[PDB]
Design a protein around this ligand. Structure first.
Ligand code: GDP
Length: 257
């Protein structure tokens, strides 16, 4: 079998180190289609199957129509083939890193969260309840130190097994309030029959994600910008408050000193 993998995370998560650990010398650098941003790909073989990896440039959030990397990441997460998205997270910086994790989880594409730098976490005497973390995120969570070649080889076994099983998702109970949820419900029908959850596309449209908006006909686009004006409060602040509230609750149940 040939499996397609996308790797994504904040800058300084250890993504390059993990990528190198997985692929070694079998890496290439080219360009993302349409632009001049470098595109890194790699591969490895494990137990007879091929794993084709595409790295995404490090970003802290998906595109929200503000102000190139965020646009490339949004494009790939919405439209690039992948049997699984690997979200690399710095375990010592959970509240900030898991912001993009929640945006990725809303898409409902198969994904796993890799908590990196568990060795750095141990030095701080912090313990993470990984079963609780899996419960809050609704996707598999694997923990490691990507600077450890043995843990990366074990990760390959676990990743291969998950890909063969198929990844079981429980979608996140993120509720944005009666008002915003009514706007989501209003837009969802125009985003049906797409490769990604219609709910997630409606939220991204309201967040003004350029990859979503750019594909809309003028009348669709007008309907989106109308529902944006219907929101009594600032959408970017609204969705951040909802996401960071959830993450505060997550960290209270997962993180112990
Ligand atoms: N303590 C620790 N540091 C790590 C680990 N993986 C990466 N790092 C360090 O994190 C920093 C950034 O790693 P890098 O792979 O370049 O991050 P990237 O920007 O996400 O690609 C580097 O100093 C790495 O050596 C790990 O498992 N444990």
């Amino acid at each position: 079998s040939k499996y397609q993998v996308l790797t994504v995370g904040n800058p300084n998560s250890g993504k390059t180190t993990l990528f190198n650990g997985l692929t070694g010398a079998k890496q290439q650098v080219g360009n993302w289609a349409g632009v001049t941003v470098e595109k890194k790909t790699g591969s490895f073989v494990h137990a007879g199957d091929e794993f084709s990896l595409t790295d995404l440039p490090g970003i802290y959030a998906l595109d929200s129509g503000n102000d190139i990397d965020e646009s490339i990441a949004s494009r790939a997460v919405l439209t690039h083939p992948a049997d699984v998205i690997i979200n690399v997270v710095d375990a010592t910086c959970l509240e900030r890193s898991l912001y993009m994790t929640l945006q990725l989880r809303e898409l409902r594409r198969p994904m796993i969260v890799v908590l990196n730098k568990m060795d750095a976490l141990k030095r701080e005497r912090v313990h993470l309840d990984l079963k609780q973390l899996e419960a809050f995120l609704g996707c598999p969570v694997l923990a490691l130190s990507a600077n450890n070649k043995e843990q990366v080889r074990r990760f390959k076994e676990k990743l291969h097994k998950l890909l063969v099983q198929g990844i079981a998702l429980k979608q996140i109970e993120l509720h944005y309030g009666a008002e915003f949820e009514s706007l989501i419900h209003e837009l969802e029908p125009m985003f049906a029959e797409q490769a990604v959850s219609a709910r997630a596309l409606a939220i991204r449209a309201l967040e003004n994600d350029r990859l979503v908006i750019n594909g809309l006909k003028e009348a669709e686009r007008q309907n989106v910008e109308q529902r944006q004006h219907e929101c009594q409060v600032d959408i970017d602040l609204l969705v951040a408050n909802v996401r960071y509230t959830y993450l505060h609750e997550l960290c209270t149940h997962v993180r112990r000193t």
